[PDB]
Amino acid sequence: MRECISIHVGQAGVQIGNACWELYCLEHGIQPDGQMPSDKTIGGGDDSFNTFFSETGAGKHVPRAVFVDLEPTVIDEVRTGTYRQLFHPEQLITGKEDAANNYARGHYTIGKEIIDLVLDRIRKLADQCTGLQGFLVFHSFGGGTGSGFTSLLMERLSVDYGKKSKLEFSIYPAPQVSTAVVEPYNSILTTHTTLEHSDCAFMVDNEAIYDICRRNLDIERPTYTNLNRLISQIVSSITASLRFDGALNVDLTEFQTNLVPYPRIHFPLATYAPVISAEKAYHEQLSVAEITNACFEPANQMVKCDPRHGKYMACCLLYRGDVVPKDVNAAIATIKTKRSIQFVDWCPTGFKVGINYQPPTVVPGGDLAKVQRAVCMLSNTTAIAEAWARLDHKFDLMYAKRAFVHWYVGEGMEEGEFSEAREDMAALEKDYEEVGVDSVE
Amino acid sequence: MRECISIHVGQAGVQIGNACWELYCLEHGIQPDGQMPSDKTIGGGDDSFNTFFSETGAGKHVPRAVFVDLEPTVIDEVRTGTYRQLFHPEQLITGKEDAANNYARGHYTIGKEIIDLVLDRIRKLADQCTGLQGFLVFHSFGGGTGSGFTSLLMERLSVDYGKKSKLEFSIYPAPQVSTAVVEPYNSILTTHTTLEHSDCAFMVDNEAIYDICRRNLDIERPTYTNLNRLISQIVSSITASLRFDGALNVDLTEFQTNLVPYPRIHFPLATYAPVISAEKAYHEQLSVAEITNACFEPANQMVKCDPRHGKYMACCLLYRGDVVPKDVNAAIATIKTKRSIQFVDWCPTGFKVGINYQPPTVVPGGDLAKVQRAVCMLSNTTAIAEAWARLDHKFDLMYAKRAFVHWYVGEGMEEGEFSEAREDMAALEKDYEEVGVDSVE
Amino acid sequence: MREIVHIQAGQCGNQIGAKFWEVISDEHGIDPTGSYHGDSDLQLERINVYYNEATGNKYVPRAILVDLEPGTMDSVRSGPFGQIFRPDNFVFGQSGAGNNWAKGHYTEGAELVDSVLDVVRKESESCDCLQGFQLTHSLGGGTGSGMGTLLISKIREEYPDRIMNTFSVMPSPKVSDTVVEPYNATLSVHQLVENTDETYCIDNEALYDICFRTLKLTTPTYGDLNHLVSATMSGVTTCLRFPGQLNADLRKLAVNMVPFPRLHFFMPGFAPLTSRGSQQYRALTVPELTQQMFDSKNMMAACDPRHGRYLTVAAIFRGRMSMKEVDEQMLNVQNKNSSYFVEWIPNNVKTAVCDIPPRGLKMSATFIGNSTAIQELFKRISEQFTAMFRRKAFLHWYTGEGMDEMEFTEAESNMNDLVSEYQQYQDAT
Amino acid sequence: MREIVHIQAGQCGNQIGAKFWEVISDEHGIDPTGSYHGDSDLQLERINVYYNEATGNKYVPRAILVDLEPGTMDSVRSGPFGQIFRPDNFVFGQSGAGNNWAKGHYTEGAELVDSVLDVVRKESESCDCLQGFQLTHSLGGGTGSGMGTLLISKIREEYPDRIMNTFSVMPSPKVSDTVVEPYNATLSVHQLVENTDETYCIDNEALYDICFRTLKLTTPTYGDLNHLVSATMSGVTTCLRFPGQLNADLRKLAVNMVPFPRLHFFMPGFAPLTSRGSQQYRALTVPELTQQMFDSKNMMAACDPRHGRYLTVAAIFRGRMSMKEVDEQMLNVQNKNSSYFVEWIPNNVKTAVCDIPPRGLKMSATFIGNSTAIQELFKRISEQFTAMFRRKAFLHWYTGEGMDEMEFTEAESNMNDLVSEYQQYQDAT
Numbered sequence A, B: 001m002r003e004c005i006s007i008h009v010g011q012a013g014v015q016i017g018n019a020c021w022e023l024y025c026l027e028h029g030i031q032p033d034g035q036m037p038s039d040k041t042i043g044g045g046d047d048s049f050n051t052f053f054s055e056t057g058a059g060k061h062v063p064r065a066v067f068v069d070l071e072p073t074v075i076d077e078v079r080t081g082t083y084r085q086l087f088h089p090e091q092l093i094t095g096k097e098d099a100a101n102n103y104a105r106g107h108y109t110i111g112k113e114i115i116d117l118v119l120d121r122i123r124k125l126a127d128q129c130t131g132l133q134g135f136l137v138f139h140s141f142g143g144g145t146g147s148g149f150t151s152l153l154m155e156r157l158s159v160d161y162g163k164k165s166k167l168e169f170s171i172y173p174a175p176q177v178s179t180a181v182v183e184p185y186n187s188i189l190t191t192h193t194t195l196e197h198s199d200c201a202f203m204v205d206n207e208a209i210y211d212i213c214r215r216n217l218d219i220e221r222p223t224y225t226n227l228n229r230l231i232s233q234i235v236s237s238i239t240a241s242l243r244f245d246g247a248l249n250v251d252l253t254e255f256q257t258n259l260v261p262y263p264r265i266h267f268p269l270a271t272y273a274p275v276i277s278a279e280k281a282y283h284e285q286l287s288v289a290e291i292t293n294a295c296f297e298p299a300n301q302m303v304k305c306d307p308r309h310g311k312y313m314a315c316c317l318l319y320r321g322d323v324v325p326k327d328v329n330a331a332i333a334t335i336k337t338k339r340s341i342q343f344v345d346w347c348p349t350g351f352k353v354g355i356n357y358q359p360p361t362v363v364p365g366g367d368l369a370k371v372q373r374a375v376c377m378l379s380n381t382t383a384i385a386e387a388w389a390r391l392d393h394k395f396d397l398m399y400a401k402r403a404f405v406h407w408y409v410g411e412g413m414e415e416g417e418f419s420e421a422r423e424d425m426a427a428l429e430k431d432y433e434e435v436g437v438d439s440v441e
Numbered sequence C, D: 001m002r003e004i005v006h007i008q009a010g011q012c013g014n015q016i017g018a019k020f021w022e023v024i025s026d027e028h029g030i031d032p033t034g035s036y037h038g039d040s041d042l043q044l045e046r047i048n049v050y051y052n053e054a055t056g057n058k059y060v061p062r063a064i065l066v067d068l069e070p071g072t073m074d075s076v077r078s079g080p081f082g083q084i085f086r087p088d089n090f091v092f093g094q095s096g097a098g099n100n101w102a103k104g105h106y107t108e109g110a111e112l113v114d115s116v117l118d119v120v121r122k123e124s125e126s127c128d129c130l131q132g133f134q135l136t137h138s139l140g141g142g143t144g145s146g147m148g149t150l151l152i153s154k155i156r157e158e159y160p161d162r163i164m165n166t167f168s169v170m171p172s173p174k175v176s177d178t179v180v181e182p183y184n185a186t187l188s189v190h191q192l193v194e195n196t197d198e199t200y201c202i203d204n205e206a207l208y209d210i211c212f213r214t215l216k217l218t219t220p221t222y223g224d225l226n227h228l229v230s231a232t233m234s235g236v237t238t239c240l241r242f243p244g245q246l247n248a249d250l251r252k253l254a255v256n257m258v259p260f261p262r263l264h265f266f267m268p269g270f271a272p273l274t275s276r277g278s279q280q281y282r283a284l285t286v287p288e289l290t291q292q293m294f295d296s297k298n299m300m301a302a303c304d305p306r307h308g309r310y311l312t313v314a315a316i317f318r319g320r321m322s323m324k325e326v327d328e329q330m331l332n333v334q335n336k337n338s339s340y341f342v343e344w345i346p347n348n349v350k351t352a353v354c355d356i357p358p359r360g361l362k363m364s365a366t367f368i369g370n371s372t373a374i375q376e377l378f379k380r381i382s383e384q385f386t387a388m389f390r391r392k393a394f395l396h397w398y399t400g401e402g403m404d405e406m407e408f409t410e411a412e413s414n415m416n417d418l419v420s421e422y423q424q425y426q427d428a429t
């Protein structure tokens, strides 16, 4: 059984999980009080709720998730809210003071006081699994709990489990827009666990999703509730072939065989192509051809980036719905025809097609439309180093004058760890300069 | 599939396109909300809507057009008006300030801010095509957006596409009637892209269509809504054999093989012969013979010109309706008999007959009549240089005192470009003196 | 998009603008309180040209009211439309201007202009894409002349690419009610030269003569003179608010009304203007509107265009009319009167045709003329100025307030120079 | 969880806190007797931030009231909310402070501080997990300056890791009503340096100027000045009590408002503030709130931030608003005004967005600024101090109470040193 554990850390990590666990309850037909309605005398595991919902006896579906925060406030929206008896009470873990935009508090001072309680709960979910696939850690680079605690947890999850995949769904700091002043110090320090302990780390940022809401979707003034529904469509498409029938299904390990070249080259950016408002979803030609081109567009990226400045290394096309595979090969061969899209010279078999039958679900109150087809494109490219050079420069400005360092040293870390994590991220950026360039003799 | 992209630039370019896209919706039987009615279980592509209308699934016909203006006001008549859900919302592109009768603003200052947005939309229509024929750019010489932006766009469309035909449908300044004081400066500066980048440029002017409405049609007081319906009948007849059955059909490239001698001799004037009011359409003998003679009449020209002062070089007769071809050859041989009509001495096979079956459509509320037959005559002649000498003289008066130059220099161009575009148009006028004259030894 | 900030200054500029915000607020159906009570859907599509929308579907004008005396502010608040304006835009001092240019441009105006420009930038920074400005003021007062040209010359340093035009009242020797008005007008024509994109010069003698001869009014008041001026001010920016067949913005006019820079002094004009009673006798057609716009007795500037040549003119028509008759009547004038138009510019006339006439009549029109005959204005001032200043009359009221004579003689000479700029472009081929 | 002990001291600090416990007690629906009469369920979920629950669903504030004179205690008991406080937290002596720092910090304050800290620890030891403290006091009195900084410097010895911040009133030379206030303020800025995590410096001249210019009040009282201050004090700890989209505690602000330690003197600010009548003319939106929070005339500290650079600022928004407009308007300010922000820190601004606006308005906001222009405050005191002390004026009222001159010159020099700490971090790249 193709089970997965979702881990939601910090305020952004919880609040995305409200948008994820809204969606799977609709994809599988589960009421907010955990009940499937009485008109289903069919195969539930044939609809395969059993990757996100362990079936309690006497008709009850409790999720395979743990919400962790160091702050009591965010998880108390889930108690009550509307999902007040969807979740088990012991898998909603709150602290008493948050890490308060401080990596040293989330990793050393405050984080060690609940880290035994979090890890002990994951084992009670790891023992209920038969065929555990891997972990789905959600957080944000640039919190205290999203960076300090998650760095503490991914160390401990690598020692206990190790061989499992551990996917991350991070929120990376945006170049112009920022909400925290100490936002660059908490992102250089989470670099060590992101490359070492995770096996495939994703990054998004809020500017690149603000522009998609404004341009592709005509929302004039988005909130975070609009954005996290777009993160959740990426996740719902990625983990889809675990739990629905289709030709060319893709497990979570068939990504990493086909998306990750070298063990430090595992930072792929995602897109999602039919982000179309419902009025613009008429006048449509939302075929396989048009939805394949939109993923390669540099304006529709989920990261503020431009893949025309670097070279792609792999892609991973995951389609949902009314999709016939001969339409996909006719759309790949147009993508390889274009000279704007540079692959590397050691790729030559470009990328991997996955297809699924289950079409996407329209959230009531949602912003999206009701489409027949949708594509997530996970794709390694060398252009994600440019997002890192725009954040090293902000770190190098503030740490040149050692500004906010006195908060971090007086909480459980040393001054010398800044000079190690700056070199550590500068070594990845040297790896992308050396993996993109073709070789001669 | 014989698809064509219509590009409508500026106020005159949009407002002609309201008269064009009114007409094709009636020729193909499309309601203003893009719907064909339910009584058509026949071949739609056999009626061939598919040169001007891409069929969205679930019964919806969206045009292959983009309306561009630098002013918000003109395209907001299309939102709402009546065609408020005929057009896709992303192909109606407005700026925020117009170029304001200033070529330097439309080409340098303001035009570059939306030129990436316009070109990116054309590619989304160029990718929906299977068998793209060419571009139909509508504008007006003597605006700012009609001249400055269109010069910017035709440069970029020549680099991206190149091999495609790019037809222009310009409105040229009239000799006595003018509406702008700086009308001659914006017409010498659009000369460079009109001869270099377009492949077959048409010219009309408002005086020569005012006289047709007053004399051939007995409208005492025409508006622009009367005139643009006459421009649209020229276009609907030219592009007709792409999308209707008939003996002797003519593609858009069979013009240029048969109408254009040399690559700089591509400025042909059009006429349209049965411009007859409905009361005068009784007492008629509107046969092939009478409708062929009317095109060669110097009063029925769409340009204020007189082809008895120069020599014809080619013609191109395009007939619609109840037309038998033996009637055409008996009408050609009368035209070659007359000595008022001078061909050149290197033509001798005079001109090309195209015939189509689909008779013209009477617009409700229109001025025209319901005829069985109609003829558009595209015809190169050396007499169109006389319209150019009447406009060089207005440019040479104002630029002798360097009058309105300070508006143009302080917006993104130099004083020296006036002296290049004046020489550039004086070289075409030297070409028509040297192409009309027969050769001896 | 294409917003307009309105900066009415002084007594005369506030009285015009108070009547101006009663005509615009009728064109868009704005209640005296500020609510909307229109019936056409075009009255709201471009209402943001003048009106910021406030809480609860109230529409506040984007107008900034300046004075150096609290009295005219108290009149506008207590008038019919005191409810319409925002109370944070009533900027006023306490000590009056003295009908003195120096006191409103140097001593007591420079003390206030910091507290006015800080309010100008609250309006301009909230707009989506601002187009320009408009002053309504009076050459001949203390605040309209002096304080108005201090406000102008401090916006071109900050907004140096926006259309700034003025609707300014110029004095006339036939109608005087101020002794020192040549000093106060010469010192502000000098500022209007280097700082303004269009200047709509208006007189009062030209406005009684329209009321006396054309309108056949018996007892004209200032409320009748400002009513004419406010019909011009709405007519110029019509195609900015309503859809048309030809459009013409503020910048589109300035491109082809102003051949050379520094020649930006226009003569306005309105048509139709009939008496009451004699409107059942005039048929309203395009040749009828054209005859009023080119008769000399329908100019709002006291000049005769037969003493010069029109460089360029513009005609903005409002109504469901044709385009042939507009393009032919504007042609049949500049051939019948070809000795009154400059002949090195073919087709001196610009036609703009909107679709929306005013709310009580069909087919209005607006004439805007760039004539060389406006040197008749600048020489009637520069003869009075040089007859007082050669005896240094009334001068210590100016040199006592910071000025000196070097500012006068410079300003006299720049007035006399542009007389020799319309003179060159009148004659000599 | 995350409780706050409130220690209001003196006359001025008690008058602010008595108005402060009338705003919080409206936000949570607390009756004047102490019962609950709210309607929203969010008013009770985090009511333990300020209120201990007592017998029979009564809610007693966690406030400790200090004075050296029984008179202000009698006013607060006999006010509207004398019923709300517990009578065991009215700690007061009998012999007054004298507007004397030494008499309230050494002689008659040290005699009382044993009987105050024993009450502070009854509140702190009953909490589940205490977060921090807050003093409300007055630099310029005897009890607010002296006794307040004795209370502070004896809690950091016992609670050395809790957020202690003060809402302290600083004097201004334009508004004086105390001769010896430079002596009393310099000797307590020296204590606030080494002992405090955040300090929200407030003036009174900055609070009349908000009432005069912004609020357009005619006769402001102290009840109006404390009403502004109490709207700041509730605004800072909003995300501590109500759920939000971004959260910001007291510690979360202090992490990214304070770059270097010892630079912890903040300028508060509130928005919206309109006059009555002129609220139907302002539309309430995020670009409207942002313009008030960065205008200089909406600072509760009498400074101009154009004489320096903001090190860091914070903006706490309260209402159902977006996050793009918050993240964009806070971006469009620190690029338009990039010469007024320190450039070695990218993105100086912290956004906090709650979900619950105040109970009479939608979309409020709170500006908190760490500006380098606060050296204008500390030099106006340290010029008055060094002009009195060089003649040793009014000194025997201090040396007679145990002090000596060595405490003065140390305290003068520590004030003059941190002037040279904002000066270094203003300029020099």
Ligand SMILES: CC(=O)O[C@H]1C(=O)[C@@]2(C)[C@H]([C@H](OC(=O)c3ccccc3)[C@]3(O)C[C@H](OC(=O)[C@H](O)[C@@H](NC(=O)c4ccccc4)c4ccccc4)C(C)=C1C3(C)C)[C@]1(OC(C)=O)CO[C@@H]1C[C@@H]2O
Binding pocket: C022, C023, C024, C026, C027, C215, C223, C224, C225, C227, C228, C230, C231, C232, C234, C235, C272, C273, C274, C275, C276, C279, C358, C359, C360, C361
């Ligand atoms: C029965 C009828 O048709 O009456 C007409 C009328 O008789 C005449 C004489 C009107 C009348 O105008 C005047 O007498 C007048 C008074 C003071 C200043 C200027 C004019 C009229 O009052 C003026 C009024 O104008 C309007 O309604 C326009 O919309 C006009 N509105 C205002 O000026 C206005 C007045 C009061 C309150 C609010 C607005 C306008 C013009 C340009 C731009 C915006 C608005 C009209 C057509 C008439 C009357 C009512 C008699 C005339 O004026 C205008 C501006 O139209 C004067 O010559 C014209 C020709 C009109 O036919």
Ligand SMILES: CC(=O)O[C@H]1C(=O)[C@@]2(C)[C@H]([C@H](OC(=O)c3ccccc3)[C@]3(O)C[C@H](OC(=O)[C@H](O)[C@@H](NC(=O)c4ccccc4)c4ccccc4)C(C)=C1C3(C)C)[C@]1(OC(C)=O)CO[C@@H]1C[C@@H]2O
Binding pocket: D022, D023, D024, D026, D027, D215, D223, D224, D225, D227, D228, D230, D231, D232, D234, D235, D272, D273, D274, D275, D276, D279, D358, D359, D360, D361
């Ligand atoms: C019809 C209407 O909307 O009236 C508003 C109002 O007109 C204005 C002018 C209010 C008004 O405030 C003042 O005039 C004022 C008086 C003394 C000190 C400070 C302000 C208002 O009195 C204040 C009142 O504020 C509240 O209700 C808040 O919840 C506020 N409450 C108190 O301060 C309070 C007052 C008395 C008793 C208990 C509490 C608050 C603010 C922050 C944190 C907690 C509470 C509001 C919105 C208004 C009136 C009633 C006119 C303004 O103030 C506030 C605090 O909102 C002044 O500028 C704002 C803008 C408001 O629009």
Ligand SMILES: Nc1nc2c(ncn2[C@@H]2O[C@H](COP(=O)(O)OP(=O)(O)OP(=O)(O)O)[C@@H](O)[C@H]2O)c(=O)[nH]1
Binding pocket: A009, A010, A011, A012, A013, A015, A016, A070, A071, A098, A099, A100, A101, A102, A140, A141, A142, A143, A144, A145, A146, A147, A171, A178, A179, A180, A206, A224, A225, A227, A228, D245, D246, D247
């Ligand atoms: N996309 C998205 N991003 C969020 C959301 N909430 C917060 N963020 C981002 O998260 C960053 C800060 O992390 P937080 O989640 O606020 O803080 P934390 O991870 O909970 O750790 P603490 O600071 O101790 O609360 C901000 O810069 C936001 O950009 C959200 O709901 N959606």
Ligand SMILES: Nc1nc2c(ncn2[C@@H]2O[C@H](COP(=O)(O)OP(=O)(O)OP(=O)(O)O)[C@@H](O)[C@H]2O)c(=O)[nH]1
Binding pocket: B009, B010, B011, B012, B013, B015, B016, B070, B071, B098, B099, B100, B101, B102, B140, B141, B142, B143, B144, B145, B146, B147, B171, B178, B179, B180, B206, B224, B225, B227, B228, C245, C246, C247
């Ligand atoms: N036949 C015809 N000509 C028009 C029409 N509208 C405008 N024109 C002509 O176009 C010329 C000016 O160009 P415009 O379209 O008005 O201006 P533009 O091209 O939109 O560029 P801008 O000046 O920036 O608005 C005028 O001289 C008219 O002769 C129309 O509807 N039909």
Ligand SMILES: Nc1nc2c(ncn2[C@@H]2O[C@H](COP(=O)(O)OP(=O)(O)O)[C@@H](O)[C@H]2O)c(=O)[nH]1
Binding pocket: C009, C010, C011, C012, C013, C015, C016, C097, C099, C138, C140, C141, C142, C143, C144, C145, C169, C177, C178, C204, C222, C223, C225, C226
């Ligand atoms: N047209 C018109 N002119 C006016 C009005 N009020 C005053 N004037 C003229 O303006 C001139 C003086 O300008 P003034 O109003 O005194 O300006 P100020 O003193 O600077 O505020 C005088 O000659 C008046 O004739 C008015 O309401 N309408």
Ligand SMILES: Nc1nc2c(ncn2[C@@H]2O[C@H](COP(=O)(O)OP(=O)(O)O)[C@@H](O)[C@H]2O)c(=O)[nH]1
Binding pocket: D009, D010, D011, D012, D013, D015, D016, D097, D099, D138, D140, D141, D142, D143, D144, D145, D169, D177, D178, D204, D222, D223, D225, D226
């Ligand atoms: N804002 C405000 N200031 C006050 C109030 N009462 C007194 N002050 C100011 O506080 C300063 C002196 O502090 P004081 O109240 O006398 O403190 P104390 O003598 O130590 O108790 C004086 O300058 C007053 O202006 C008040 O209610 N509000």
Ligand SMILES: [Mg+2]
Binding pocket: A010, A011, A071, A074, A098, D247
């Ligand atoms: Mg948190």
Ligand SMILES: [Mg+2]
Binding pocket: B010, B011, B071, B074, B098, C247
């Ligand atoms: Mg236009």
